[model samples]
Target: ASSVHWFRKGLRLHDNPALLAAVRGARCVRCVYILDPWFAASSSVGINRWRFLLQSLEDLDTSLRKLNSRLFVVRGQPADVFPRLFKEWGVTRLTFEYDSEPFGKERDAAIMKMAKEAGVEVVTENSHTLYDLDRIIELNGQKPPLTYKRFQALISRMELPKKPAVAVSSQQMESCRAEIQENHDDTYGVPSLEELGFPTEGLGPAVWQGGETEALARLDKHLERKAWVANYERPRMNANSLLASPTGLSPYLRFGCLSCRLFYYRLWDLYKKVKRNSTPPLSLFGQLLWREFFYTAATNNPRFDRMEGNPICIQIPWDRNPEALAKWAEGKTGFPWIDAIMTQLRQEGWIHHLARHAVACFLTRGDLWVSWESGVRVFDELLLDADFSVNAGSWMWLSCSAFFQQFFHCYCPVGFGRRTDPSGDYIRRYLPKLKGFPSRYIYEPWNAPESVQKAAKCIIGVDYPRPIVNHAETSRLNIERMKQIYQQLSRY
Candidate 1:
């Protein structure tokens, strides 16, 4: 029987249940990737993300070629594209990794319905999150766990994830490739960014290289440091550090370039060997569980991404200050620490998780009092590693809308960075003009004396900007405002 393996987020061959099922016992198998314009046209996807995706597709195509097969690329909606392929390629079976998000679930349902009518057998499996999200919700009495602790409780009652499957054997791939017919056009293997209507110029320096090869290499290198992996602590990591702060495996995980099961088991094996090791919600294993947690949260909550209709999220009247938001987006916030982080986010398509917390809080309840939805929209566009569930859940936590309730513990932009890097090296790296400033005045260049500013060859409100708002005063006012909002919410 001729079958088709559809690549979506599950980009790698190893440990991919859907891909393996497509090739197994099939007379021939065709690997396919569809570049859906719905995702490409949306503002939620930015240039940096597009570039990264293009690179990953290229990598995936290269890997498939090694197995004597190539990924077929076609542009159009899946509904429009697949029916034609089904008829032309004489495809009898279709398979893909399951997507749990509301939009993906809906899309998959439509396609599955279409597939049934067309006489194509559809098969799907969940390989994205560590556990089956639906199963987790079912075990929890059909309600999503509201907190990480509760989520962990549910996990404790469940079985550990199975070991990852070995790589696809060459003989299996050869058998599958032998069945590929020459009816469909294979001309469009992997299209360039320009072909997708994105400008190739000004793509900027790459923060990461995409592909399974790069992803696996990074994981292997990090695992080589057994002690570092064993004693790893999330809190102690510096956001400003230029080094690979964590595993640098997030993008790989996000794009399915690396299998989560592979990462989990690899870390777990090493974790068992460590004389002293941190545990869940903090350890490397804990970090993987957090991804699963967010996936489960988004799976159960359709309105998890928004505030107005969300049952769990507390409503707060946020300001519609475009001017303030634009300033933040453009890295013109005039707060050195905030601006620096924002600049890094835009320039490079990723930032440390803690750095995300600082900016997310600043935008929502802490300083700007804007909506978490707005913050997520920006992150959705810029972050190469942005996952829908994690982005929304994180924004909610940082904004104090849900999950976390510590509205009083706001990140003092100046103080937070200083505590980590007193030399202000991180701020200086991104904000180059401020490089000459003294370390003492680096975080708050506006606070520098005229002589110090002159000596540093940078002038506040001239070469650089003055503080956009009084951090000390505004932070206090924001705390009080949040309390009032919380009281109003309680009354409801």
Candidate 2:
């Protein structure tokens, strides 16, 4: 009998549990990966995600070709798309790994229900994360850790095991579709910026590359480059136009080009190889686990989507400030540090966590009615490695609607620039309006001398948008608002 492996996000053949199961159980296995009409049809998803997914799919196809099989590509709602495959391929069973994001979980539930009624059994495996969602939550004592340190401590307590891999056979591959072809319209000749709706001819070009090969190469570099995980207690501030210390494997992990379970095994191998007597490597591992934690939070909590909090902050008032939001989005809020981060995000598809927090706090505290979902949607388009579960959960956590509100986390952008990016070189890279200004006043061009402003060839309010809302006043107001919620919740 033949089985179909319905590859949703997992684009790779290696180390895929669902693909392995299909290979072992069936005489012949046909592979189909859908573009999921909802996403492909909508322009809401950014070009970055599309480009990343395309690269992953291309790589998966090449790898499968080595085994004498190729991926069957289709684009439409799965309800309409898979039935045709079932009939045409004579597929008796359909298999795929489970997903945890709210949309994915709910959609899969509906899909499974439909498949069962059609007399086709659907089996799913937990191949996305190092541990099952429940197992990770249980290990964290049924309550997610708010701080990274506590989460790290818990991760250290667990005994991790190596993963088993899938070995492909030529006979099994020969039985499947070896040359399943798509028209020229469907194939991307090369990963060209002009093809992906990015500026192919520009001042320069995007600093990042998109592909599985690039991702693995980055992982190798990060591991080999002088101990990125060593004593990384210092929280990362947004360092733009330069490399930020990260695995840069997020896109690989995001699109399932790399399996999280396999990543865990490699991490363990590194730990054994380094054998460094320190808490930092373990802490970095916790960073990996935090990805799962946020997934659990979004899975368990539905209000995370609606933006309504539980106890004290329940139905807390919010404002729909549109102009302020536009400034934040366009990187024109006149706060040098905040603007720099936004500028970087627009150019590069990613930013550091500290910048993420800074941007979130500025928006939420400014009384902008920016839903966590809204932020996720925007990032989903912009970030090459945008993980839906992690993005939404982190946004809600910052909004203080889920788990806990980060009270001590108010980001003073001007002060942050003064201390962290004191020279303003980071600021000038993206914000050319401030490039010619002296380093001392580049972070606050409004504070520059009148003669200096003329020399710098920029105007404070005209060239750079004036500060949307005063940070000092807004910061005080934010603290007071959060303090009220804490007091009320304290009684609970």
Candidate 3:
């Protein structure tokens, strides 16, 4: 009897559970991919995630083809599609890896019910995370992470599994290649963009290639040219294209093109190769722990969608000033540092991870208590590798409303820029409006004399607009509000 292996997140063949289990059991296995219209219809599916998902699905299809099995990509709701497939293919068993997000969990529950009603066996496994959410919760007694440092310590104590390599040998794949489903896609053609009702707009075409091959290539390039992971300690907070600042592996990881275990193994390998004993691996590993932390947070908490406090920053008390929002969206915030990162984000669908933290600090902390949700959505739209857990958790962390409240991280842009971007190379590159100002003057264009501003051709008030609110005034307001939020939250 044939079985159906649902493909959604996991796009790789190397370390997949659903696909592997399906192939091992069923004499004839059909790899099925359900592209629900709900995703395409959602406003949150911004250009970055949309394009990344399309590539990931295409990549998965390619891998299945090489194994002499074809991916039957059907577009519709999963509950509706699964029953139809069961009737058509006579599939008695269903196999799939589960997504831990609230939406995914709900969807999986519905699908499982549908399968059971049809007398089909359902097998679900975990592939997306480094640790099992249920297991971790149970071990920790299902409590929220108290602090990043504390959460990291608890996670560090656990022994994580090594990367699970594909169980099938080359010989096994070769022997079954012909017998599996060779003539499957002979009649059906690959789905087109027009068929999906998507119109191509920017980058002159789909800029990057799709599939596990390209994912591996990217990892190789990162190690070869950049060796970025080895020097993860240095603050590389400049805003460039998303690919330049951080490892461009997030999109791949999101869609299961890259395995977390493989990523961890490679990071460990790089650390050993560096042989820089003076530096602790803690800082580097801490970022990985942050990844796990956010994943755990989202999996555990239903309210993971917004900032931690109950006043609802985005849902309520948010200034819905469209013009102001648009200006921020278009990277014209009048704050040079803020605008620089915003400009890079709009121009290249990405920015540095740390720079994201800085801009987030400026907006939620520096600007005002102007809805972290609005800032979150802006980042969501632009960030190429925007993971839900990381995005929301980061916003909360910056706002000091998360489980761990750190008031000291509230950064003042002028001082931060003067120290971090001392040469103003980052500012000048993204803010050509400030390019004419001297490096020292770049951080504070307003301080430049009228003659200097004229010579530099930068009209501080007219060209860039004065800082939205006075930095000193805003800083004072933020300190008091932050104190109130923390004081109220500490009682919890």
Candidate 4:
């Protein structure tokens, strides 16, 4: 029987159970990634994201070639692409990793229905997430474990995560050889940035290079320090850092170039070897578990990413201020810390987690009073590590719309950045215009004297922007508004 493994988020050659199932006992197998070229040009997903995806596809195609096969990168919606490919490739089986997000689930359901009508067998494996999201919810009596503590307790009672599957080798595909035509590259090859309607010029080398090869190299680098892995403490900040290197496996995991199960197992095995008789702390495994927690929380809810229909989310009348949001999004908020973080996000597609917290708070409940939904869209476009479940979940948490309730605990944009980076090195790195300012005025460039600003060659309100909002006044008012909103909720 002929088989086809459809690649979506699971971009890696390693730990792909769906691919394994497709390769087993098949006379021929075709690995394919289908995308809509129309949406590629006009979609809200930015250039960096497309560049990363195309790079991953190229990487996947390269690996498949070693197995005497090549990945077919097709262009069109899945509904249309599958039927065509099914007839074209003589495929009897369709396989893909299970996507836990609601959007993903709905799309898969439609595709499965179509596959059944075409007399093709559709198979799915839970490789994107560590545990099947459905099982976690089902074991917890239908409703998702809403809190972190509840999730932790439930998982503790459950079985360990499944061990990762071995990578697909050249020998494994010897029997089910993928037929490749001479014109394969022209018809169905990995796309370039220009092909995807992105300008290549001025877009330099990637901060986080995509694909399994880079992912594995990073994971190996991170694990090189066994003692650090054993005693991994979630830093409030990774100090004096400009780039997320050695700590940069996030984008890899996001793109599924790295398997969550593989990462989990590696960490656990290393923990046991390094720290005899002592179980690793929540800090060590909590990141993966937290991702699982969000997947579990978001899996069943169709409206998990939004506010109105989302049952888990609290209904709050957030402001609709596009100008303020644009300023925040473009890193022109005038608070050097906030702007610098936004600049980092747009340019490098990453920031420190705490930096995310600071910027998220500034955008929503903390200062601007913008909708968390708006913030979600921006991060979805910009952050390399952005996942539908985690991104929305985090925005809601930081904005006090869900998962957290300390609305008054806002991050003071200036003070927060100043606390971590006293020398303003981080700000200087992203916001080069602000580099000339004194350390005291780096976070608050407007506070610098005119003479001092002139000496620095950056006059506030000319060379740099002034603070968008008065933190002292706006923060106080926002707190009262939140307090009132909470009080009204309590009355009901």
Which predicted model would earn the best TM-score? 4
Task: By TM-score, rank the candidates, best first.
Answer: 4, 1, 2, 3
* Candidate with maximal lDDT: 4
TM-score per candidate, chains pooled = 0.94, 0.86, 0.85, 0.97
Model 3 TM-score (2 dp): 0.85
- Taking all chains together, the TM-score of candidate 4 against the true structure is 0.97
Tens digit per residue, CA lDDT, model 2, 246-361? 45667677777766776666666676666666333545566567786677666655454555553212454566666777787778788888888887777777776767877777
For model 2, the superposed segments whose C-alpha errors exceed 4 Å read: 36-43, 136-164, 167-171, 178-206, 225-247, 276-281, 309-314, 366-373
lDDT of 4 by residue, 1-492 (tens): 799999999999999999999988889988889977786355388777878888899899898888888989888889877888888878899999999899899999999998998999988999988787777788889889888888888887778788998877689797888778999988898889887677888888987787999999888777777425433633434455545666577888889999999989888878788788988766578778888888899888888889999998989888889899999999999999999889888887888778889999998888999999998999999999889999998888788888756545988998988898898888888889878888998898898888889988998898888888999999999999988887887543
lDDT of 1 by residue, 1-492 (tens): 689998889888878999888888998888888887565355657777877787888888789779888788777778888999899889899999999987889889999998998999999988887888888899999988879988888988988886776788888988878443465345546767787677767665567877787788888876777435443623345543543334578888999989999988887776667645744333457778888888888975778899999988988889998988888888898888888888888877888777888888788877888898988899998987888898998888788888857555878888887876787888888899999888898998888999999998999999998777787788888889888888777543
Off by over 4 Å in 4: 40-42, 226-236, 404-408
Stretches of model 1 off by over 4 angstroms after superposition: 37-40, 178-186, 202-205, 226-235, 239-246, 276-284, 404-408
Residue pairs in collision within model 2:
46-381
Model 3, residue pairs in steric clash: none
The sequence of per-residue lDDT tens digits that candidate 3 reaches over residues 406-468 is 467566767776666678878888788789898867878888898888988998988777766
TM-score of 2: 0.86
- What does the lDDT come to for candidate 4? 0.85
Alpha-carbon deviation at 179 in model 3, angstroms: 10
User: What TM value does model 1 have?
Assistant: 0.94
